[PDB]
UniProtKB/Swiss-Prot annotation, chains A, B, C, D, E, F:
Known function: Stores iron in a soluble, non-toxic, readily available form. Important for iron homeostasis. Iron is taken up in the ferrous form and deposited as ferric hydroxides after oxidation. Also plays a role in delivery of iron to cells. Mediates iron uptake in capsule cells of the developing kidney. Delivery to lysosomes by the cargo receptor NCOA4 for autophagic degradation and release or iron.
Lineage summary: Eukaryota, Metazoa, Chordata, Craniata, Vertebrata
Keywords: Acetylation, Cytoplasm, Cytoplasmic vesicle, Iron, Iron storage, Lysosome, Metal-binding
Domain of life: Eukaryota
Native source organism of the sequence: Equus caballus (Horse)
GO CC, any one term: cytoplasm
Region (Catalytic site for iron oxidation): 53-60
Protein name per the record: Ferritin light chain
Record InterPro entries: Ferritin, Ferritin-like, Ferritin-like_diiron, Ferritin-like_SF, Ferritin_CS, Ferritin_DPS_dom
């Protein structure tokens, strides 16, 4: 077994595979979120685009992790992908709340894997997470908090109007 | 009678002529809708443009149908065009409601003609409807549903403000 | 009722609505004329283009009139559009004869409306007709007379050949 | 036998091979028609070009059919190509009459194959015919009817002059 | 429930959701196939690219289906995604064998859904499958059969050399 | 009979018509050869392109001959086109063997016609063959011999690998 593998614990290999599952789960969640906002009875295009873009980003993170797994001589192993936690996601506010919960879980998974890499003395893993994941997550979580604050401000009284305005003037489409 | 006509039933020929009447009726309805929104006491320019654009699209569909009638060796026959169902169209919401009702009737007419073509074993007619009409109608009806949802969200409380905002931030002009 | 309306009689308002009906009728007549010449058993493409172009021009005149109706604070009211006077239009000669009869009726309607505007002391209406309609009609009627003369010259003896030649060498396609 | 073949009946496979023969026959007919009009004692260049262009179109249709046969896992089988029905094709009128008869036979073959695909529940075949053949045939047959009408109009009295004029002013070269 | 929904059976809606699951499953299978060929102990880059490209194509098909679901007024419902059938995919030959089996299953699912649309008289669904899926699948399955034949020819005697050569001279990277 | 014909024997006229049949036969043979190599169970794209290109070249030669027939005042006469000698063409080697046999027969037909032109003292015919056919055939036959030699060298031991390599590194696609 691997001719290239060096300083790459079975523990980190397994944890990388679990993280791939988590990122692909998050991608699937964002696919569901995106298409919910494209429903004719929800129709918030900018919200749809925001979530579909994140579906792509999460999928990219999984592919980054799989490439890394191979560069270290580990073996990608895929598991069932569980469906998203909801079939309908409520208002933009509800949806952003669910998204920041999801991001925080990914973030905690990254931190846990960092702490494993540190215990296993694996500086290439630590560097890899710092280079492509930790700051990325921090920036996204901040953006989502900014959004939540703006949504929140808009939707006390006149909830519908606030939702429309946030979609039109903050979100991209 | 026609040197080119082949596999083209008198039933489909008549039904094509009726569909032309329906599309020209819808065009006239959208002309009336467009100019209502240009009234100084209504003054929603983006709404006016949205309906005038559809008047053009419906007229184009009628001309497509007439060209097809001729390519198959059928004979265009024109009937009186009935005036639109209303002289005043109310709010943007009322107007979009009336437009989606109209589109659904055109859609049902297309489906009925498809079902006739299928019973008459006329695959060129079926192809023609699929190529230029069925998806076009589906996309338009979806857009209108999206609009209705957004209008609806805006006009619970503060009806005037919501109407202005929808016109300014969703509709084109 | 209208905050903008000034010096705009109910008589001119009604007459503008009737003129809109006439122009849309003429547009429909030219649509029928155009597609007749596209029949495989008539097949005079340049004739078809000449009439379809006029269908567009007449529709534009109606839209000009409706825009004016709104700029003056009048209220567009639409009536049933009667179908064209014939289902088949004969030869190019027959068709041009029918077209110049139609244009003369539009012209007389314009003159009558001018005479109303003059009796109502409505110089904006008079200016509007002079700017966009009266000369336009005069030029078109002259063109049609030129055509009739050329068609007429061609179709004494050898009627078919003359018809083909006029279509090929005078009409555009 | 084929690793790719799926939902592709032996009946449709055979019928596709027969259609290839028909299209290559039609191509050969148009080659003969083209070169007849290039004879120094016929010399109607535009007619020659019109038929040679159709020879190419028919050959292209056969190649489209053969490519499809292969994409479905069927087996192209070629038969003898029968020579065209005439060695001399008469006037432009005679020739256009013969061409529209030929096109109608191809059209009927396409319809028959459509009806077979429908009975065999082969929606890829149906789509393939709709995409590349049915409308193409309808447009060509209409063009030919237009031509026949114009030729017919020209060649009552002064047959030679009419023939020259049609070739010069309608046909391309 | 939906203001836009018209002629859209609950049966087709459910079947569209199942097809989305199948396409996302196939995408996941191709992700696993792609990264297997990127393993340092397999190292066939062109094979990896071929499968990763198909992972993207299958994901795109699912998104096309979800967009359609929304345009018709149906409701996207997501299920668990089962992991791919194998963790290791053997040789290029083994892998292409598995891929054509997968494609044929997608193809059969498309055909079944076509047959449902036909039984439900849903011509927009039928058109949608013809426009974006049926020919696409046919072309891909043909390409894969071509590949299988070439792989097969190369890997009787000198299996390693044949595998390298196919990757270098047929597959893209 | 012909006003232009000069120094053009009935013998050469007939022989030109036979040569046209031969060239169109060869074109049909190459069409069959081309599509055989496009079969999913043969799949040698470069071989397919090589033969389809020759189908076009042979057809061009027939059209050159027909144009010449007309320029001399002869009369093109078309006969039945016999189907190709095989339905399946074996390996690339088998196919190239069959192609060089065919070319040699065309070449011998050209030589025979040259010898007829010489006996009939027809220097325009001789020039015509020298200008457009004799060298063309010589170059093609040489190319095919080169190919046969290279195929032959490759397919002693490891027949499949040799076939793939010849297609990839010598033939165009
Ligand atoms: Au979305
Ligand atoms: Au979106
Ligand atoms: Au998007
Ligand atoms: Au770390
Ligand atoms: Au570390
Ligand atoms: Au990165
Ligand atoms: Au954002
Ligand atoms: Au308007
Ligand atoms: Au407007
Ligand atoms: Au507009
Ligand atoms: Au249909
Ligand atoms: Au049909
Ligand atoms: Au269209
Ligand atoms: Au819109
Ligand atoms: Au026209
Ligand atoms: Au026209
Ligand atoms: Au036109
Ligand atoms: Au006046
Ligand atoms: Au006046
Ligand atoms: Au004007
Ligand atoms: Au003119
Ligand atoms: Au020709
Ligand atoms: Au020619
Ligand atoms: Au030509
Ligand atoms: Au069919
Ligand atoms: Au079918
Ligand atoms: Au095509
Ligand atoms: Au033409
Ligand atoms: Au890959
Ligand atoms: Au790759
Ligand atoms: Au790739
Ligand atoms: Au279907
Ligand atoms: Au259907
Ligand atoms: Au597509
Ligand atoms: Au490929
Ligand atoms: Au080929
Ligand atoms: Au090829
Ligand atoms: Au080719
Ligand atoms: Au000679
Ligand atoms: Au000679
Ligand atoms: Au030459
Ligand atoms: Au070559």
């Amino acid at each position: 077994s691997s001719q290239i593998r060096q300083n790459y614990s079975t523990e980190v290999e397994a944890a990388v595979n679990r993280l791939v599952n988590l990122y692909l789960r998050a991608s699937y969640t964002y696919l569901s979120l995106g298409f919910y906002f494209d429903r004719d009875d929800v129709a918030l295009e900018g919200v749809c685009h925001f979530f579909r873009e994140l579906a792509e980003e999460k999928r990219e993170g999984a592919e980054r992790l799989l490439k890394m797994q191979n560069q270290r001589g580990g073996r990608a192993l895929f598991q069932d992908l569980q469906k998203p936690s909801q079939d309908e996601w409520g208002t933009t506010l509800d949806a952003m709340k669910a998204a920041i919960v999801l991001e925080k879980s990914l973030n905690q998974a990254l931190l846990d894997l960092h702490a494993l890499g540190s215990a296993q003395a694996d500086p290439h893993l630590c560097d890899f997470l710092e280079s492509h994941f930790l700051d990325e997550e921090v920036k996204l979580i901040k953006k989502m908090g900014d959004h939540l604050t703006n949504i929140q401000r808009l939707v006390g009284s006149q909830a519908g109007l606030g939702e429309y305005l946030f979609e039109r003037l903050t979100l991209k489409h």
